[PDB]
Assembly symmetry: D2
Homo-oligomer: 333 residues x 4
């Protein structure tokens, strides 16, 4: 059926595997040049933020075995050398962060991948946010695709609802974001992101993200109407979007919440959720949604100028969307 190969067994690769297991999608191979099979077992079995894997994990004859599913493993430094074609022609999830362009990722294709999903923004690959524009995917012309960013996946669904109901004249986004693997435990080297080299654990760290502007790629009507930035703070997971926007049509705060509520119950079900509870970040650790609107946290200056709040599990929600995109793409073959 749908079969999946994963390149890179970092945080995304591992959670993607977990999600595939949960959604019953067959993973046929994992490739990582650095992480051997016995070590894969350990990294998958135990997880500091998401807990122990709820099934069984073992290594056998150079294979990763998860709940009796035997998964091939490779240690190729070059995508070109991965034998995708010898193990069916799976969809490939590209999680290394190193092959973002269509040209770079196309290496997978030449080695036998039927299609490729890049788990990061791409300079040129078509970008998709489930619930927003996946229907623009076209199998006739799109062999390599991007699932955008965790952040864009949180903001876009919310921007869609607000724009379609009220009209976003212009918006500026801040994401208060958990620290990540690219960061440092103590002040260390990060030569093209100096602030990002500073102790992740000790600091609030300003960061530049194209995540808000990129919404204009999945919602063309918003091109040039959004940008923003980030603060990385000392939490290990879960992040929050803080969107300040001016609306075309005037909207009471209650009209806004009612619109979001309706979207969550209906067309954006499973993508955008809604809460009125007095929640905090940990309440969304392990939440599969792309975006959870926080009604009570937001505030309006007036009917045309408002600040909207939405939570996202930047690891798990995004990983869930990657698998959702694979499934959708496959339904379109």
């Amino acid at each position: 059926e749908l079969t999946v190969g994963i390149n890179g067994f970092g945080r995304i690769g591992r959670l993607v595997l977990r999600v595939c297991m949960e959604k019953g999608i067959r993973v046929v191979a994992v490739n990582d040049p650095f992480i051997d099979p016995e070590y894969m077992v350990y990294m998958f079995k135990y997880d500091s933020t998401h807990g122990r894997y709820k099934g069984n994990v073992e290594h056998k004859n150079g294979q990763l075995v998860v709940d009796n599913l035997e998964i091939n493993t490779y240690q190729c430094k070059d995508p070109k050398e991965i034998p995708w074609s010898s193990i069916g022609n799976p969809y490939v999830v590209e999680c290394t962060g190193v092959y973002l362009s269509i040209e770079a990722a196309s290496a997978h294709i030449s080695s036998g991948a039927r299609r490729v999903v890049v788990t990061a923004p791409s300079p040129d690959a078509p970008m998709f946010v489930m619930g927003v524009n996946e229907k623009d995917y076209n199998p006739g012309s799109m062999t390599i695709v991007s699932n955008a960013s965790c952040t864009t996946n949180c903001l876009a669904p919310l921007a869609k609802v607000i724009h379609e109901n009220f009209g976003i004249v212009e918006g500026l986004m801040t994401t208060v974001h958990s620290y990540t693997a690219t960061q440092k435990t103590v002040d260390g080297p990060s030569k093209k992101d100096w602030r990002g080299g500073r102790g992740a654990h000790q600091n609030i760290i300003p960061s530049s993200t194209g995540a808000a502007k990129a919404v204009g790629k999945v919602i063309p009507e918003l091109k040039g109407k959004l940008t923003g930035m980030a603060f990385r703070v000392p939490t290990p997971n879960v992040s929050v979007v803080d969107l300040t926007c001016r609306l075309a049509k005037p909207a009471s705060y209650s009209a806004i919440t009612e619109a979001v509520k309706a979207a969550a119950k209906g067309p954006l079900a499973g993508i955008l959720a809604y809460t009125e509870d007095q929640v905090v970040s940990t309440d969304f650790n392990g939440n599969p949604h792309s975006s959870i609107f926080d009604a009570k946290a937001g505030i309006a200056l007036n009917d045309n100028f408002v600040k909207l709040v939405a939570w996202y599990d930047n690891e798990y929600g995004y990983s869930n969307r990657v698998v959702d995109l694979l499934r959708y793409m496959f339904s379109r073959e």
Copy 2:
């Protein structure tokens, strides 16, 4: 000369004492119903975020002795019972957070305080931000005063510059704020701020603040043009203001930075500072400024819609302003 009595030996009271020592202002008494003199020594001598006191601290004959300065100590539960009049008639810094109204704080006056500064917003007491409106202080009519909040003290100076140069049509503020003493180490009781009861250390915690709106009290032209909210995050000190505003007159980002730069060098010197360095929060721990503009962290969508970033040491900067206000008030007797 100017003499100072301090009520409450919590974080603010202790740093205020430290600042008084640093600026050579004589503190004649500290009152706290709970913290005995020997314990005062310990709490003042050692500080997890601001380091050890750089001088000497001892207890002797029921007095706190700091760098040979003998300071009286009291343990009164009721301001009315504090013998201010018997030890000169000092200005009193009210740091308990419990006597915010003019009526409540007036207890100090009836017991002999010449004037009172409330180290928190007040329902009715006149509110002042040094560098913004202290000149509206009037000794003929104002015996009880408020130094506003740490947050308002960061935002107001910046809002002044932006408004006076370009005009703020409307603005929405978010402060990413370090956790505080009102918070909890683990999920515990906070019955009129449920989110604030959740583990401070584990969570990004949305919080409601009137700090942005209160800017309209010190800058009347901005009444009704500002509001905002907060996220409390797992850092012990230093916070950051994130102001999204629409400007009347169009302003390039460089025009904005040049205006702020000029204010810092001139009329707002010692209050508002300016940086273009790749800074993070810890870089401002122990900074005495009310607000440090971060040129490179901010971002503009266009000449009329911008997001501006300013740092503040919510403990030390504010404590410095409290003492500055005392000194100014005294210069006006």
Copy 3:
């Protein structure tokens, strides 16, 4: 059958309720003077370290409703005024930390509690560690009992195995322990534990515990042979015991691990667990065991002098034991 009333809805009270639900023990009432029913719902529904409650929680007609179980709620400041006798005569779990002595806790009895388990060490109430000395419980004479401390519950089972196999001549314990509700977010007041007032999140904090010595109360042969202390560190949950002991009979490290392994598989199953994996603290969050021996972390200088390591979820493991003690006590009526 067995029915349970819980006094105090703090971390222990809440997890005890959770465990009772999990093990099918009927809780008939919760008393807390400060936490109202609607707030109880919130505190139980969401948990920063243990995640959302996996069932349903609502408030109705002054009752807490958990998975359709209607639970009475009270707000009595005095145990004497709690109507235990009016709702059957349940076993009472005393979790406030305020009524530790037999005399203080007996208030529950006079108001109708059939028996009382104090979830903390008691100056005089008989103390029990499941798997070690519960069989010494006697329903004829013991109406008020203590479940000791989390720490003692981790150390005692391990000490039992080591003593019975090899003989502990003497031992010194350090527990590296997560911060707790008694600690402070920032340097604040703690007049009979000065170090414990210091910022929990910023500091390694030495602490005095009678937990190791108290093992001599549940294992009489070890009276006078054990003591120790603690370091509180910036983790929200899960702790670790570090036991340095001299052995009577010489024991290779492999002999030691084999003994612990056998104990875990057999007589101490469900109390003591055993691992040889490369684990860290988060791997034991939500673990119900009293003690998980870490084979590879320990180290021996020689056959008679060794350092042994055992993990414990100081919240959940202990809460499980409280309920286990209730069940055992009931089987003895």
Copy 4:
């Protein structure tokens, strides 16, 4: 006079530079293949744990300029290619962690370094702890030397005092240690230290250290009498030694503290310090001592079996000793 070149501008290299400035030792060059001069300025100027550099730092003409001292900079990947001989023949501090053996470090020598101090334990280079065995240094035969580890530098001075006064029959050490640059922000790859790959900020992490055993290299009478291990915890700096030892001669706890006190006031002044205050870890951030004995934190089971506690700033204290070792070595030329 004494001139110093530093290889590697990581945490140690930077603090060593800071210390050299403070103690008036001339640093003539810094080499780092990755960190360019402009970036060096930034990394030295700002420090998350130790605060901003208290002087001036600039880059000019490929030179690092600190308080008007012009320092050469190089970007050589191979020690052999560093022009030590062209800039006098300085002592070289080897801080990369990559050239630990006499053979590897000798590359510095062949390129003109007069002597080399390795800022880490070495498989074969003579190891020194200031205050313990520096007098065994011999310039006739020792061109390459090691300053041992931060941990060994904390334990050895304390062990010396205890052994010389009472006799250590055997001891087991635990160090509760702050996380370091080798650790990871979130669960990531660490193939020869699996536990050390786990999130540093979320976890208590058991770690194997030869630091206690290595004391037998600087105090020969203790060879085979000491070993231990570590727990890495979520603090950015400052660590603590927890030494459990059996004594030959019986010693009251007061006898022990009196011995340490006398050692600190006399022969080990500037190396070992002594406190009876209710201290916590942050109280020692920026402390230059190798070891600060904590009298009140320790505990004795009896006169021959005791647990002793000593703090160390694992970054700054060690860096100070490196420079002290350089100075001592030079006094011996």
